[PDB]
């Protein structure tokens, strides 16, 4: 019954009336399309996307129904609603400058769903497509920080950190503007990870050690961060900086609880 839905959308496009009445009628049509299943639902929603991006339809009518269309989407399982994610993402192009909130929501949803199917490659590329630089829709400093953090973390898992360095780049650009401390803690953990991955084991150990003496970080995470600091210090280039970090790491009693406690103990005491 997708053809009937498309015919109703075409007839409602040429109809004249108040914005509230048109929005309600379109919302009812959207609900009817959602009630469908299989290819019929997919084609009905595809026609709904085409109608919203159509020039004649008002922007307010378009922006909210796409938002309402996006809200019902996570309810549909991980399958048919994803070929329309690519379809909707490419569909928003003549009016991509008009609104980017719906594009941002779709990309965030698509990246998380790609993250579900152990896919940090495509999830990264999708989330790169966000125009955070614009500033017209002034994404709150946390949101730009959150998005840049997610791309870096996604690029860390598949380990192609040529762009992740360039993405931890713009992340710190907006970082010294933000407010949320937990986001700052999540950033420093990711930044400490980025140093660990590239070649910066000595710098990662410094960042991990600084984060080790925190209070909001979980005690298990604090031990894990210190364990990374100990591993980075051992793997770091053996020099004056590494020796000082080895001396510093010989002070924590939670270093002693770790299995590598003996390793740096033989290391710093000289063997």
């Amino acid at each position: 019954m997708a053809a009937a839905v498309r015919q109703d959308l075409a007839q409602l496009m040429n109809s004249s009336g108040s914005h509230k009445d048109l929005a309600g009628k379109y919302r009812q049509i959207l609900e009817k399309a959602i009630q469908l299943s299989g290819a019929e639902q997919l084609e009905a929603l595809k026609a709904f996307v085409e109608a919203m991006v159509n020039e004649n339809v008002s922007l307010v009518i378009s922006r909210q129904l796409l938002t309402d269309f996006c809200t019902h989407l996570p309810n549909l399982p991980d399958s048919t609603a994803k070929e329309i994610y690519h379809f909707t993402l490419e569909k928003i192009q003549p009016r991509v400058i008009s609104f980017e909130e719906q594009v941002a929501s779709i990309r965030q949803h698509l990246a998380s769903i790609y993250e579900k199917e152990e896919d940090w490659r495509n999830a990264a590329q999708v989330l790169v497509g966000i125009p955070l630089e614009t500033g017209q829709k002034q994404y709150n400093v946390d949101y730009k920080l959150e998005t840049y953090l997610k791309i870096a973390r996604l690029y860390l898992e598949d380990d192609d950190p040529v762009q992740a360095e360039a993405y931890i780049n713009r992340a710190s650009l907006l970082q010294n503007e933000s407010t949320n401390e937990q986001l700052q803690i999540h950033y420093k953990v990711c930044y400490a990870r980025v140093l660990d991955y590239r070649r910066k084991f000595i710098e990662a150990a410094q960042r991990y050690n600084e984060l080790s003496y925190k209070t909001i970080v979980h005690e298990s995470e604090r031990l894990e961060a210190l364990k990374h600091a100990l591993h980075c210090t051992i793997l770091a280039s053996a020099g004056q900086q590494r020796s000082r970090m080895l001396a510093t790491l010989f002070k924590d009693e939670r270093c002693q609880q770790l299995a590598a406690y003996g390793i740096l103990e033989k290391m710093y005491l000289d063997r």
Partner: protein, 89 residues
């Protein structure tokens, strides 16, 4: 329609953005401290190490360019006298 647009003469401004790169004096990065801050000082408490923007739109660490100003003062990427137009990113 009653009113249709034929001509448009808008002005499109361009700005060099994503200026992340490398403080060429320290050769570490545009940010993330410098050689005089990751190899020299250990405490790094109540410290800063910001960026330093000049009139010629070049960017370096504040620590790196200030120390470079001891002997030479000619912005080694050119022969400009390197006025200090901004600090930080």
């Amino acid at each position: 329609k009653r009113f249709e647009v034929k001509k448009w003469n808008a002005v499109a401004l361009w700005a060099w953005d994503i200026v992340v790169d490398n403080c060429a004096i320290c050769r570490n990065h545009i940010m993330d401290l410098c050689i005089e801050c990751q190899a020299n000082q250990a405490s790094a408490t109540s410290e800063e190490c910001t960026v330093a923007w000049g009139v010629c739109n070049h960017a370096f660490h504040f620590h790196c360019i200030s120390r470079w100003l001891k002997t030479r003062q000619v912005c080694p990427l050119d022969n400009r006298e390197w006025e200090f137009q901004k600090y930080g990113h």
